[PDB]
Amino acid sequence: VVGGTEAQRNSWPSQISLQYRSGSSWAHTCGGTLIRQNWVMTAAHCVDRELTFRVVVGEHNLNQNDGTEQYVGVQKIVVHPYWNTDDVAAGYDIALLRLAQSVTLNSYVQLGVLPRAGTILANNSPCYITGWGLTRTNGQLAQTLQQAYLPTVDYAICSSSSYWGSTVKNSMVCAGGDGVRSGCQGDSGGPLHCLVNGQYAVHGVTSFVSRLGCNVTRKPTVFTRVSAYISWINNVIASN
């Protein structure tokens, strides 16, 4: 995330790091949200490649031992049936990862709370994006988990000509756009946490930013709207 600040140690316990094997090492590629002890919600584009993936929960610093990490393999990947890698603007950028083993919940590993189906945030709702993604457009991943305050931009405004126009759909949530702060590559698949009735809930799965760059004025970060997918999520967990 660009223009963020380091998150307090595990203040976002449902945030996970999705990593793939590179030779004999592991590289972080995307974020995700732990939604069941053995299920992770991420972006479908994060798993377009047929790589070996692992999920790390309780993570904070990617390249240093935090003493709280749990590592687990991904046993099954269920991508939304309508996802089309050639058309991220069509939406459906969401996938569920069934973990090889259930992780242990504790102070650093907790389930993310999802909104009620159909919920839409009022314009300018307070939200935070979190992740280890690039700290600058075409930059490098962050070592420690970052967070940025990104107020929502409602559909009417977000789909206007000066913003994203027709590229954005109602199945998405836009947030930020101030030209300073934003999600970026590597935050993809991670959460957009927003305060709802005293509870932070994960309303978005990071999907895309402008081809011109991450922090671009009037090009808010775009997320898959989690509340449009509650039934699908429940159905996947129920049939696996």
Ligand SMILES: O=[Se](=O)([O-])[O-]
């Ligand atoms: O009402 Se909704 O979340 O677009 O199905």
Ligand SMILES: [Ca+2]
């Ligand atoms: Ca670590």
